[PDB]
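Name: SAKe6AC-LB
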Amino acid sequence: GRIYAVGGYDGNTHLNSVEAYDPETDEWSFVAPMTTPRSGVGVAVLNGRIYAVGGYDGNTHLNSVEAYDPETDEWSFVAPMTTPRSGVGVAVLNGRIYAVGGYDGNTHLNSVEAYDPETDEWSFVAPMTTPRSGVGVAVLNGRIYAVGGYDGNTHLNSVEAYDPETDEWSFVAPMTTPRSGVGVAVLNGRIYAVGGYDGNTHLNSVEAYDPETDEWSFVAPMTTPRSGVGVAVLNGRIYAVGGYDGNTHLNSVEAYDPETDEWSFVAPMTTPRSGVGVAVL
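Structure predicted for SAKe6AC-LB:
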């Protein structure tokens, strides 16, 4: 019932600090920091633990992975991925964590690795067609969606969906606007693509995907443009956390109500964070 903002970049330093948001009180507080600073980190929740996957520590693109236990307020390393990835998208489906795309320091990646917490092992699955760093990933009705990103040459509006029964990626309908550094969340049967960068502009626009019609539509924009934004869903609202508006790394946080189609500000974090990972536990 809390939102965790993990790592990121405050405009001067890559962060290992972590803050947690309580909606009952509308306040952020620090929890235990990670061992390794990570911006462009992917964050997933599985079986009562938060996983911080990859990222960039200011000198190295990371293949290491840390797990947070809220009962002990402790981070521990688990098995590393084979390939280092910053700007990686992370999703959980059927008891596995998927690390999707990213950048390894030399190459934008279309490879995908899956983590089994019981064996503490990563293994490769089918790669996507298009390489994507700064990709947003979400899970809806048994599929993983890889949304937008940057392939090394172009900012992408294409979207691919992964079916674990067939181990295959397939394109679905593209967004209207290309977005890298996009935040993606699932709420009430729709995927929301929040913010990002289209190659010329940092975005405050938001598009919603309905898988029944295979169509994207614009919804209300946020007040502040945000690329490198973290997005999470809690108690029926979507939270857009931090990011970069084109001039400033942000500690502000906006919440979206789909019934009113409105964004409103909530309490800001203490530390500005772009390239931040966000998850709900």
